[PDB]
Copies of this chain bind each other. A is one copy, B any other.
Amino acid sequence: PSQVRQNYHQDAEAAINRQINLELYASYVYLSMSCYFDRDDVALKNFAKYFLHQSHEEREHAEKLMKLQNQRGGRIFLQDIKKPDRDDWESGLNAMECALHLEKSVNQSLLELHKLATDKNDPHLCDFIETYYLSEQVKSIKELGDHVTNLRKMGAPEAGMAEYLFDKHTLG
């Protein structure tokens, strides 16, 4: 074993490698949304800015899980990063609704990982997930729900001034 390794089960080492690939895939989906809003037939620059910011945040989450795996004396194994489900994201409203669905699937995976660390009696790993990951997911899910509510009430997508004025006043 590694000279530093203590109280660190092989099931937890394997589950951390699965979470690293999921954060890298989330970063790639947000990059694809950012490219779509910069097309000349779409042209919404504060929507493009917003999704490029989310893409860089998800890469930082991934690089912080790699640091934890080396600190406990586990070994990192990388896999393929699969392509997104779509190339064309249809509208400002539909992109926000797709992002809300993604963030809820990442939160479900983190809750399953906390349950495994609890069953293996790893208190350091439980505290790391609570402190750096769970409170950030709850904050992101609430912001995306508030954006979907306002866009639906203004009459997006059919009311043509709706996505233009939301790009200026909320995302500006």
Binding site for B on A (CB under 8 A): 2-4, 6-7, 28, 32, 35, 38-43, 66-67, 70-73, 75-84, 87, 100, 104, 107-108, 111, 114-115, 121, 123-124, 126-127, 129-131, 134-135, 138-139, 141-142, 145-146, 148-150, 153-155, 159-165, 168-169
Q: What's the number of copies of this chain in the assembled complex?
A: 6
Q: Which of the residues B107, B129, B168 comes within 8 Å of A169, measured between beta carbons? A: B168
Return 18 A-B CB contacts under 8 Å, by A number.
A3-B145, A40-B142, A40-B146, A41-B149, A43-B145, A43-B150, A78-B83, A78-B87, A81-B81, A111-B123, A114-B123, A115-B121, A123-B129, A124-B138, A127-B130, A154-B160, A154-B161, A155-B161
Whether the pair B83, A80 counts as a contact (CB closer than 8 A) is: yes
Top 4 nearest A-B pairs by Cβ distance?
Answer: A81-B81, A43-B146, A40-B145, A127-B130
- A123–B81 Cα gap in the complex (Å)? 30
A67 to chain B, nearest CB (A): 8
Whether the pair A164, B168 counts as a contact (CB closer than 8 A) is: no
Q: Given A6-B141, A40-B2, A134-B127, A84 and B78 touching (CB < 8 A)?
A: yes
Whether the pair A124, B134 counts as a contact (CB closer than 8 A) is: yes
Q: Which of the residues B43, B72, B82 comes within 8 Å of A80, measured between beta carbons? A: B82
- A169–B108 Cα gap in the complex (Å)? 39
Q: Given A40-B70, A80-B83, A153 and B164 touching (CB < 8 A)?
A: yes
Whether the pair B76, A87 counts as a contact (CB closer than 8 A) is: yes
Q: Which of A107, A139, A141: most chain B CB closer than 10 A?
A: A141
**Which residues from B are CB-within-8-Å of A87?**
75-78
Q: Which of the residues B40, B84, B134, B169 comes within 8 Å of A3, measured between beta carbons? A: B40
